Amino acid sequence: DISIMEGMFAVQHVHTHLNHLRTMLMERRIDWTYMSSSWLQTQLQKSDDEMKVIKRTARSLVYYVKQTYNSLTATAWEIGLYYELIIPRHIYLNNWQIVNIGHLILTHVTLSHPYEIINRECSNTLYLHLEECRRLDYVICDVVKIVQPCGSSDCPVWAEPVKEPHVQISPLKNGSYLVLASSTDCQIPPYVPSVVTVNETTQ
């Protein structure tokens, strides 16, 4: 009995990993535990950190599952996998998004910026304009362009008439609020955008 129960543990251990592989395959991902992935790091020369992005954003497709041996104490199966890999060119690990509020003087005035992302990963800041981006895991974009910071650059100014009161409030995702109000019922300077944080609930 102990001889049998010792071998049963290996069966359970294999069962867990096989179930995980089945879940990953039904999920149109790739289980890299079952695949080597070491041969393609040398064929195309990439860093260790750049290979993780390639591994993470891979999509798979199963086009045949078959059984070749059907003995009572032995079995053999085959799965055909077709998968697609996305090769990157840059990574841009440190990013900041830009929100434009402007000021009102009614007339609402907002400056126009060509760039949308600021990169501080390098020593100098980079200004990136993104086009046709896809939101799957990390942001995937076909084209990103470096542009000048509204200097060696030109920025149009657009002003639109708006009626009073025209108050706008935006949550800041860290608990603060962005307020742009012509009128002032709370202790807030008018006509100037402000960041507001409160200790208790107030209106």
Partner: protein, 87 residues
């Protein structure tokens, strides 16, 4: 009480912590998995009775996977050619 800070020119910056990849090209590959139980049986020390307990699990898992896959063929050549279709 309230806390304050005046934005100078009405421009604010959001963290936005997700990376941006800027892909270059996309590649496609094919591969076969070849699940076999004899290798696992030999690596362990199964005794002709726990082997049948392993093949049963492998068979049921593989059948469960195979119950939702359509078993088609991958196009690789040219639609016009007749020799490949004849083959």
């Amino acid at each position: 009480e309230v806390n304050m800070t005046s934005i100078p020119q009405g421009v604010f910056y959001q963290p936005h912590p997700e990376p941006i990849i800027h892909t270059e090209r996309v590649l496609g590959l094919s591969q076969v998995l070849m699940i076999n139980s004899e290798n696992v049986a030999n690596s362990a020390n199964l005794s002709q009775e726990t082997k049948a307990l392993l093949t049963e699990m492998v068979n049921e898992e593989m059948q469960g996977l195979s119950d939702v896959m359509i078993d088609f063929e991958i196009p690789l050549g040219d639609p016009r050619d007749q020799e490949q279709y004849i083959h």
